[PDB]
Write a protein that binds this DNA or RNA. Structure first.
Length: 52
RNA sequence: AUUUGGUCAAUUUGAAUACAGAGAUCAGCAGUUCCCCUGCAUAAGGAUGAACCGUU
């Protein structure tokens, strides 16, 4: 009686606090190139405007 | 045997003015892409050095 034979326990499964390591999203070479092209282009444009 | 291939435009007109029709040439530098070298940063990843003992 003091420990019941009848019941089956389903105790709370303790979830471990997994540290969210934000994933290093990489770039394709092409993507990188595009980025380089665009930022640089923008800079150039700015220079032109700020020199014209 | 004859003849067409033959109308300057433009402007001022209500034929005159025009007269063929209105930038060139030489030279820098930067950017764009790709490559190579060099220095720095960023990540990652090595390799290695340095006397001598440490911490409740």
């Amino acid at each position: 009686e003091h420990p019941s034979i009848r019941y089956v326990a389903h105790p709370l499964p303790e979830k471990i606090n997994e540290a969210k390591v934000s994933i290093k999203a990489y770039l394709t070479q092409h993507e990188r190139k595009r980025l380089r092209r665009n930022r640089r282009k923008m800079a150039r444009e700015a220079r032109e405007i700020k020199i014209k």
